[PDB]
Amino acid sequence: HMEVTEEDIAEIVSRWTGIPVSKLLEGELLRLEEELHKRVVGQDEAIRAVADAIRRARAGLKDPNRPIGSFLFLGPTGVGKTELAKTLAATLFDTEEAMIRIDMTEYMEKHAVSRLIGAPPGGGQLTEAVRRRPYSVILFDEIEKAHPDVFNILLQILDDGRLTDSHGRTVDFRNTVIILTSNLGSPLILEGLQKGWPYERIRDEVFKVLQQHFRPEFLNRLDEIVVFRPLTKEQIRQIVEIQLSYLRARLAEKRISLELTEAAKDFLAERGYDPVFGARPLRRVIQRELETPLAQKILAGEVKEGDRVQVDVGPAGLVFAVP
Template structure:
């Protein structure tokens, strides 16, 4: 019984504040999120080519800066759930004989009944975000398939069924140019620098030009010509790493909340986690490992030993020069009125 106009208005408001919603999950990367948001708004407003997908993007930049995370956040924002993300790892299609698995094996071959890995997933879930991870590893034949999807918005599978890609967002990630970025220390992780002004912007533009130049040598012109946007991700600053630590710790808090246990982490403990997990070459991923080793593993052991019980709050603090201490928060004695 909800009026259609109200749904349309709510959808319009959501789209106008799309950047804010995506920034809740993806730290930094303003240019990337702006580009994606504009493409989605254009499509929803009816201004896109009706034959083509909602948008097609190549995400570029260093490893561990949020390329895959943005694809997941977009799937959740647009279609309500991360389950609407169809992720295909292109390292599985490095050899020519594997390429047919995308559209299905031809009649008479093993696997004909199963359908294609890409076509079957999109046929069952036509409103989705298709993530083709590490596209540079794919065999050149894969790009012939992608040309048709990007230009015509459909693909015919091995059974002759036409699969519609017009309601999908195609995202391809690539680490092309990442190695050359690491050689240039000014383009990697930077020390604490709150001034994100002209110098930082100039560094980003240099990095962008370098990556796009390598992209042109790696992929064929007719493929690049059909992609809507090339989105180059920035390296993460220390301040952004601090936000990511908070996001990762919030996940631990949510998991402990199901057992009715609270979690507090002191500023000193967070600084220690950042110091250990802040890596020039690997982006934010080492942080996850550091939090797993220093916070989650001791917590798991303590929970199994029964050290913490429901209703308690656990405090994580800096302990000595080397590690962290995890102890129950001392309960305050209630003051009678």
């Protein structure tokens, strides 16, 4: 039957049950890694770890009273942790609105548990969010900064697959994916390399800090611990291309094409990435170095509807030409 699609029936069931369409159609998942890789460049280990856990859950091999998966993402800033969490949410649960982000720097000071689960009688940021979206990816950023009382609430999620809030009502976490992140150790490695420390010192100091913050009792609860890697030159270039996608689409409305030389791509990659911030700088590098001067060319009439635009490097920055 052709006229009524799989999506038609899935949408009916989804609206009646609250189960996301992609969840209902999970089986009609074996290429989850390739789907995640459409947005997340590299970090193959993280993608495989997440995909492996989801498969074990779908195959009926895990404890049904725990979340679908739980992970600790270690490694540096700006290399794909949040991008993977956002992409996973969009892929598993149809929208990035299915990602719930808890910034643990806002939960450091003792009375923060009431912020998480609701003030005691006489609601909570986490509990209310998960009640209204049981099918969600939950991202806890910078977990080592959480107050112990807040950290104990995370342990409850991992152990019981549920939380009781301050109203006394149980909040179901069994359909969530829990992603915990920390950059712990990464600034220390940068400090050692700047100071000229030998690798042995750097290594030993990273392990003692990890030992201090992350104990086996905690870590044993997790599906996997994954250390994100710094990005290679080729990976940063692929990220530049992904980050030009929306610009190209907007330009294509006026039939304008952009053709970047390899040097122009390398210009953006060089400025858009560093060890401290990862690829966090790239968006505003593209805005400043490409979009702004392109805007001036369009407004001046030098770049017109229908033009193919060559983008190359000059010593003042990127330069433009229409052949």
